[PDB]
Curated annotation (Swiss-Prot):
Name recorded for this polypeptide: Endothiapepsin
Part of the full-length chain shown: 90 to 419 of 419
Entry similarity comment: Belongs to the peptidase A1 family.
Encoding gene, per UniProt annotation: EAPA
Known catalytic reactions: Hydrolysis of proteins with specificity similar to that of pepsin A, prefers hydrophobic residues at P1 and P1', but does not cleave 14-Ala-|-Leu-15 in the B chain of insulin or Z-Glu-Tyr. Clots milk
EC number(s) per entry: 3.4.23.22
EC supergroup of this enzyme: hydrolase
GO BP: proteolysis
Superkingdom: Eukaryota
MF terms (GO), sorted A to Z: aspartic-type endopeptidase activity
Keywords: Aspartyl protease, Disulfide bond, Hydrolase, Protease, Signal, Zymogen
Disulfide topology: C255-C290
Organism whose genome encodes this protein: Cryphonectria parasitica
Domain Peptidase A1: 17-328
Active site: D35, S199
Length: 330
């Protein structure tokens, strides 16, 4: 089997991407944030505290004839951005773009933090990291991809995120018309539960490529590119007037600037992020200072190849016996 669904930026800055997902019988369609950096499929629901729901579409398990409460199961997750959610657990039928899993754990939120309430465009998350990170207790549950894997034509999924434009998540096949050149595959460590790999270096604009190992994670649920302070300083040094702002919490730059591109290495191959992908717009409404899309990972403990990097590439998440990651230009 295969599945294919279109993923769409939630706003004009590509702050995140949403993909429609069918849950239950009859289908309830929710727009979920596909997140290769986490492993819980959770949704706003009829159980969510009412004051915490502000425009999201909710899953109502009582209206799904295939929903079954998973007895005694709860979940609670806290994300790197400070947001969180928690609740109970049903199993139900879940379909993405024509691909169907019966018995998928659907984590129904009783509580969400303020940032989720404030984002009316995200109905929940669909985790695509490794199932060892799933938070369901006392019996950990499998991700949608883990459940679908054995049925897929090939044990893979692909992310093709657009810049200011729709894109595609495919399960079970590689669309060889979706990228240019070849796909370069690189090794993955699953020891932290992530799609963790080692970039071979970077360049800023037309500058010299610096060979240096950058360990980090391919994370479709993180907006920006988080890289070591030395690399981020080298990038923003090329932008007249850019500086690191303590009040804003990262590098900012004059909105009148034209940004240089940023290149990262995948083996001997190179992915080029165009400069405009690095512009996240005014720091506050009406400001002429703009937020940068490359920021330091120094306070994180891990580098994050988020959407800024991934949307410059066609990305294969290869769930073969030994998982690997593939990147092609597009």
């Amino acid at each position: 089997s295969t599945g294919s669904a279109t993923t769409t930026p939630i706003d004009s800055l590509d702050d995140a991407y949403i993909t429609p997902v069918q849950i239950g019988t009859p289908a309830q369609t929710l727009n979920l944030d596909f997140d290769t950096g986490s492993s819980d499929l959770w949704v706003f629901s009829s159980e969510t505290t009412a004051s915490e729901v502000d425009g999201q579409t909710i899953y109502t398990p009582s209206k799904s004839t295939t929903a079954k409460l998973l007895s005694g199961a709860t979940w609670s997750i806290s994300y790197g951005d400070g947001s969180s959610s928690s609740g109970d657990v049903y199993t139900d039928t879940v379909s993405v773009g024509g691909l169907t899993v019966t018995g998928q754990a659907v984590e129904s939120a009783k509580k969400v933090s303020s940032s989720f309430t404030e984002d009316s465009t995200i109905d929940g998350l669909l985790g695509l990291a490794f199932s060892t990170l799933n938070t369901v207790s006392p019996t950990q549950q499998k991700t949608f991809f883990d459940n679908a894997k054995a049925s897929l034509d090939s044990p893979v999924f692909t992310a093709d995120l657009g810049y200011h434009a729709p894109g595609t998540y495919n399960f079970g096949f590689i669309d060889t018309t979706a990228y240019t050149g070849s796909i370069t595959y690189t090794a993955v460590s699953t020891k932290q539960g992530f799609w963790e790999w080692t970039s071979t270096g970077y360049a800023v604009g037309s500058g010299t490529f610096k060979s240096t190992s950058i360990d980090g994670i391919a994370d479709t649920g993180t907006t920006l590119l988080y890289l070591p302070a030395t690399v981020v300083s080298a990038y923003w040094a090329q932008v007249s007037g850019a500086k690191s702002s303590s009040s804003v919490g990262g590098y900012v730059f004059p909105c009148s600037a034209t940004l240089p591109s940023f290149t990262f290495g995948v083996g001997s191959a190179r992915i080029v992020i165009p400069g405009d992908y690095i512009d996240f717009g005014p720091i506050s409404t009406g400001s002429s200072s703009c937020f940068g899309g490359i920021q330091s990972s120094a306070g994180i403990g891990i580098n994050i190849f988020g959407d800024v990097a991934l949307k410059a590439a066609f990305v294969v998440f290869n769930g073969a016996t030994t998982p690997t990651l593939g990147f092609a230009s597009k």
